[PDB]
Each structure stands twice: as structure tokens, then as C-alpha cells.
């Protein structure tokens, strides 16, 4: 029920600090009264205007390990370039990132999308410490992709040529991402060390407008 699971709100508080406001949330994702994922966050916005996101996810031991643990959102902005400090320049995933080098990379947006004839998840870059898009900047230690196509659209489209640019830009930021397999394409082939099975996962982001 990973595709069907809906967030239930457990907690949502606000506090005023000396130099910041702190928002504290907690969600459960459930399916048939089974809890799959719990997501405990904090958001810390201070006088500098930086948003310090902290995410703490729990994953039921008996659910099949997730494909990723991350945040997504559709940005209004449509910028021409993408600029990041991390593994690149090409698409790279956890079990396929030896070819990529760590450096400051600047590409056009269309280079962040891989035109696989059969549409799927694509264009992830790993080991990213800084991501720049238009006015936005995310800092931390994550994996991300950024394209004009939602995961939903990719999932529902059987051919690349039938895909259409969505209004705004879809950003996928992941603390963690499952490996991609390949040993074959007819049985589970993602090796154990690239499966998201730790049970509890942590990642922290900082979102500013520089």
C-alpha cells in the first residue's frame, strides 16, 4: 500500500524562540490500519531567513523496504539552469555512482531528465551538499532529481513521447534512495547493502533564498 497510503496528522505545533520560530510535526502513513512510515519533523526559521528542516523517519520492519525516504514539492519557478555541489554531471544512483565525480556542476534543466523510452524514476544525482535552482538553495547531504515531470506522470506514462511538461518544476529531495538493480531485469536484483532497511533514518536540510 505504499502507493495508496495517506498521511495522518499526529502532531503539529508552533513555538516562538529567542531568534527563530520552530514548527514541530509528526505524520503516520497507513494502509488498512497498518502503519508503514512515521515522519517526525522540525522546521526552524530564524532571523537570517533560513529554514532548517530535520526529518526522522521510522519504517515498519515487516514492510517491504521503500524505494526512497525524502520530500517532494512542485515549485512554481521554472528556471533555465540547475547548479549543484555533488556527484555528476550525469545521472547517478547509489549502486551506480562510481563513474560520477564530486564537483560544482551547472547544466540546463533538460539535462536533469533522462529520456528513457519507457518513463520511470530518473535523473537522480547523489552525494549532493548544495542545490541551486532559480532563487532557491538547499544545503545538506542528500540525493535529488528535478524535472518538468511528476513521479505520478512518469509512473502513468508508457512512452516518453506522450509525456508533457507540467506547470512549474518538480523537485525530489531524498535523504535516502534504494539502489537500481541490474544483475537482471526479471527478478529482484538490488543487492542488500543498497536496500533501505535500517528502520530508522535521519536527514537534515536547510532551505534559503540567497
Give binding residues for substrate as ranges.
Answer: 186
Q: Which is nearer to its own copies, 155 or 198 (CB)?
A: 198
Task: Take residue 9 and report the three cell numbers written for it.
Answer: 496528522
Contact (Cβ atoms closer than 8 angstroms) between residue 15 and residue 22: yes
Q: Report in angstroms how near the CB of residue 91 gets to its own copies at its nearest.
A: 24
Q: Report in angstroms how near the CB of residue 89 gets to its own copies at its nearest.
A: 23
Q: Report in angstroms how near the CB of residue 93 gets to its own copies at its nearest.
A: 19
Contact (Cβ atoms closer than 8 angstroms) between residue 16 and residue 44: no
Q: Which is nearer to its own copies, 15 or 156 (CB)?
A: 15
Q: Please give the helix or strand (H or E) that residue 154 lies within, else none.
A: helix 151-156
Q: Which is nearer to its own copies, 142 or 170 (CB)?
A: 142
Residue from 208, 68, 28 nearest 130 by CA = 208
Whether omega before 89 lies within 30 degrees of 0, making that bond cis, reads yes
CA distances from residue 148 to 51, 53, 107, 142, 168 in whole angstroms, order as listed:
25, 24, 15, 20, 7
Q: Report in angstroms how near the CB of residue 103 gets to its own copies at its nearest.
A: 16
Q: Which is nearer to its own copies, 75 or 206 (CB)?
A: 206
Instruction: In whole angstroms, give the CA distance from residue 124 to residue 93.
Output: 6
Q: Which residues fall in the annotated binding site? A: 186
Q: Which is nearer to its own copies, 38 or 78 (CB)?
A: 38
Helix (H, G, I), strand (E, B) or coil at 52: strand
Interface with its own copies (CB under 8 A)? 10-11, 13, 15, 17-18, 22, 28, 35, 38, 56, 58, 60-62, 141, 200, 202, 204
Q: Report in angstroms how near the CB of residue 182 gets to its own copies at its nearest.
A: 22
Instruction: In whole angstroms, give the CA distance from residue 107 to residue 111.
Output: 6
Contact (Cβ atoms closer than 8 angstroms) between residue 201 and residue 178: no
Amino acid at each position: 500500500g505504499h502507493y495508496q497510503a495517506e498521511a495522518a496528522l499526529l502532531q503539529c505545533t508552533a513555538d516562538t524562540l529567542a531568534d527563530a520560530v520552530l514548527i514541530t510535526t509528526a505524520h503516520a502513513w497507513q494502509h488498512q490500519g497498518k502503519t508503514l512510515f512515521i515522519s517526525r519533523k522540525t522546521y526552524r526559521i530564524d532571523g537570517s531567513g533560513q529554514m532548517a528542516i530535520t526529518v526522522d523517519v521510522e519504517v515498519a520492519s515487516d514492510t517491504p523496504h521503500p524505494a526512497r525516504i525524502g520530500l517532494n514539492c512542485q515549485l512554481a519557478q521554472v528556471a533555465e539552469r540547475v547548479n549543484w555541489l555533488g556527484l555528476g554531471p550525469q545521472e547517478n544512483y547509489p549502486d551506480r555512482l562510481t563513474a560520477a565525480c564530486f564537483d560544482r556542476w551547472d547544466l540546463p534543466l533538460s539535462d536533469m531528465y533522462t529520456p528513457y523510452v519507457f518513463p520511470s524514476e530518473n535523473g537522480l544525482r547523489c552525494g549532493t551538499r548544495e542545490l541551486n535552482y532559480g532563487p532557491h538553495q538547499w544545503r545538506g547531504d542528500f540525493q535529488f532529481n528535478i524535472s518538468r515531470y511528476s513521479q505520478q506522470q512518469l509512473m502513468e506514462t508508457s512512452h516518453r513521447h506522450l509525456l508533457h511538461a507540467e506547470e512549474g518544476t518538480w523537485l525530489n529531495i531524498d535523504g535516502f534512495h534504494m539502489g537500481i538493480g541490474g544483475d537482471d531485469s526479471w527478478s529482484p536484483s538490488v543487492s542488500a547493502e543498497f536496500q533501505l532497511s535500517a528502520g530508522r533514518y535521519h536527514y537534515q536540510l536547510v532551505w534559503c533564498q540567497k
